[PDB]
Design a protein around this ligand. Structure first.
Ligand code: SF4
Ligand code: SF4
Ligand code: SF4
Ligand code: SF4
Ligand code: FES
Ligand SMILES: [Cl-]
Ligand SMILES: [Mg+2]
Ligand SMILES: [Mg+2]
Ligand SMILES: [Mg+2]
Ligand SMILES: [Mg+2]
Length: 581
């Protein structure tokens, strides 16, 4: 037991925790900035969490454990003057121009500036931003006129991926954040997962914009612009319209997309059902041939980059099915003209993703056929919200509409893709039916769901027991491989997601402030929307999707062979040998 006094209030406690956590647990306001993910910036503490401890002086609450006898003051003039001073020193290195800024509505730094009425000693007003901006990547952008050097991106990359692809760099005697040797992120071991963006409290890290690609296509007379959103968008975008967390906004999105001028409203969940058709067929092929094993999923481009960069010997074990994004895109240039009369060259296919790595996937040289890209543009959840707001579309008051069905219907198995273990569960629902030539009623695989980092299960398919794993976050892939877990038993099918929680926690998603993250389990609440859709959909197996069945019957043929394999599959170039690299 300890006795603590905070702002005159005595507490008796046996907790072993920091001042900051104890105070917040007890409804005592203490500000913080660089603290996130249970880490602060050890080499450059922001000190926004400063408090006074009698007999010690000023201390950082976010990294100081409570101790018996402490008498703490969080709101004295001296404490508040120190905090204001720290914010002022940050304004000295910050281009404070919120009007056109992409974080204007949800910036953590602006909130602190306002709270403490802080002002720079000397305004930072660079007349030209070229030297501060890196837009080389297909997925990420850096604007160092906004960077606080808070280290939250560095810490978050370490925690989420263990790549440490985001680093502190010494650029002629000045500290910046960036990739190894100040290279373009894409040319390093970076996965392009954008977890560093999600951790950034300001507009310093962003997605590489595709909004101009999209607007130019919408305004081109002869382009027919398809749009299709990822599973997770419908569970997330409402947050950016003050609608709260866990709101299913599917119908409003379809309406908003029509109001933005898109010419066809499809859904990547249809592509999710296509990927299952192919992937479950491939798994059954491997089961009936008793190998090869394991098969890894290939639908998360952060994981694909992780394999290319660290485990290229596993590229030969990846499923060859394209991801829902790319498989949908391929079909949008082949099947869709065949049922519409559109000239394939005039089709422009746009996805809305919770993900920055998806932009790199869509821009891979070989992701095209006959000169036509599978996918022409990828906008994040954040970018779609901005497009809606710029168009003055009253999202929260829109009536619901439906997708155009031909490439827009989806089953409950497709619906769950955006949660960790969703691909696994969806794939098993079809694989078991295929292998057993049956229509099984027991389709829920709750043992692969949820936030555990490594989830294993034994499944019975056609009288044989098989082992599956769901790897939940890139750091957990490293743990599974480096610890030898892959060799502890024979795995047959392994799902890997780069973002912990699955795509509902992707790097293109709405930012959430640290206080809301403590109040709301964002990964669970966003995923709950998707599981709810599956629960109430009539068709809960990808192979029961009626639009999909017609597509295969009339155009692609049998999945997993022939035309479907020729067109809808992809093997990574780095799977084969080359030297040098
Ligand atoms: S990052 Fe925040 S404080 Fe800085 S200009 Fe943008 S909104 Fe304003
Ligand atoms: S890019 Fe963002 S998270 Fe990273 S140090 Fe700069 S302000 Fe902090
Ligand atoms: S995109 Fe992912 S791997 Fe690359 S620096 Fe950001 S968090 Fe690290
Ligand atoms: S888990 Fe989803 S959001 Fe994250 S990198 Fe992979 S595809 Fe993108
Ligand atoms: S929030 Fe405590 S040092 Fe930054
Ligand atoms: Cl249609
Ligand atoms: Mg620390
Ligand atoms: Mg220092
Ligand atoms: Mg148009
Ligand atoms: Mg193949």
């Amino acid at each position: 037991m300890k006795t603590i006094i905070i702002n005159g209030v005595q507490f008796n406690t046996d907790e072993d925790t920091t001042i900051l956590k104890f105070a917040r647990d007890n409804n005592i306001d203490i500000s913080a900035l660089c603290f996130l993910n249970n880490c602060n910036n050890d080499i450059n503490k922001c000190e926004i969490c400063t408090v006074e401890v009698e007999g010690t002086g000023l201390v950082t609450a976010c990294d100081t454990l409570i101790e018996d006898g402490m008498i703490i003051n969080t709101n004295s003039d001296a404490v508040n003057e120190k905090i204001k001073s720290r914010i002022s020193q940050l304004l000295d290195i910050h281009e404070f121009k919120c009007g056109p800024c992409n974080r204007r509505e949800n910036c953590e730094f602006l909130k602190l500036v306002i709270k403490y009425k802080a002002r720079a000693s000397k305004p930072f007003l660079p007349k030209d931003k070229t030297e501060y901006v890196d837009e080389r990547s297909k997925s990420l952008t850096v604007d160092r006129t906004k960077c606080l050097l808070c280290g939250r991106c560095v810490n978050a990359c370490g925690k989420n991926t263990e790549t440490y692809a985001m680093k502190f760099l010494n650029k002629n005697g000045k500290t910046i954040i960036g990739a190894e040797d100040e290279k373009c992120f894409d040319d390093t071991n970076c996965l392009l997962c954008g977890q560093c963006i999600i951790a950034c409290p300001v507009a310093a890290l962003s997605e590489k914009s595709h909004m101009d690609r999209v607007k130019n296509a919408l305004n081109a007379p002869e382009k027919h612009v398809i749009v299709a959103m990822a599973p997770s968008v419908r569970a997330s975008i409402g947050e950016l319209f003050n609608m709260g967390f866990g709101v299913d906004v599917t119908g409003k999105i379809y309406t908003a997309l029509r109001q933005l001028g898109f010419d066809k409203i499809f859904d990547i969940n249809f592509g999710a059902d296509m990927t299952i058709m192919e992937e479950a067929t491939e798994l059954v092929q491997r089961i009936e041939n008793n190998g090869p094993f394991p098969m890894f999923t290939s639908c998360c481009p952060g994981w694909v980059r992780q394999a290319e960069n660290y485990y290229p010997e596993l590229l030969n074990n990846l499923s060859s099915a394209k991801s829902p994004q790319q498989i949908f895109g391929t079909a949008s240039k082949t099947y869709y003209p065949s049922i519409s009369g559109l000239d394939p060259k005039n089709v422009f296919t746009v996805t809305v993703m919770p993900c920055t790595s998806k932009k790199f996937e869509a821009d891979r040289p070989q992701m095209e056929k006959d000169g036509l890209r599978d996918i022409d543009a990828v906008i994040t959840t954040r970018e779609l919200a901005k497009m809606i707001k710029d168009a003055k579309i009253p999202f929260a008051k829109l009536e619901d509409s439906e997708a155009d069905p031909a490439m827009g219907e989806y089953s409950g198995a497709g619906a769950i893709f955006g949660a960790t273990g969703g691909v696994m569960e969806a794939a098993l629902r079809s694989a078991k039916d295929f292998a057993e030539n049956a229509e099984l009623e027991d389709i829920e695989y709750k043992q692969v769901r949820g936030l555990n980092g490594i989830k294993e299960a034994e499944v019975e398919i056609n009288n044989n027991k098989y082992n599956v794993a769901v790897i939940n976050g890139a750091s957990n892939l490293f743990k599974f491989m480096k610890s030898g877990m892959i060799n502890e038993k024979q795995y047959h099918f392994i799902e890997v997601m780069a973002c912990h929680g699955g795509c509902v926690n992707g790097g293109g998603q709405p930012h959430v402030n640290p206080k809301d993250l403590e109040k709301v389990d964002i990964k669970k609440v966003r995923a709950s929307v998707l599981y709810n859709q599956d629960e109430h959909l009539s068709k809960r197996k990808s192979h029961e999707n009626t639009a999909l069945v017609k597509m295969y019957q009339n155009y692609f043929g049998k999945p997993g062979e022939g035309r479907a394999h020729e067109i809808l599959h992809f093997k990574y170039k780095k799977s084969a040998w080359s030297h040098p690299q």
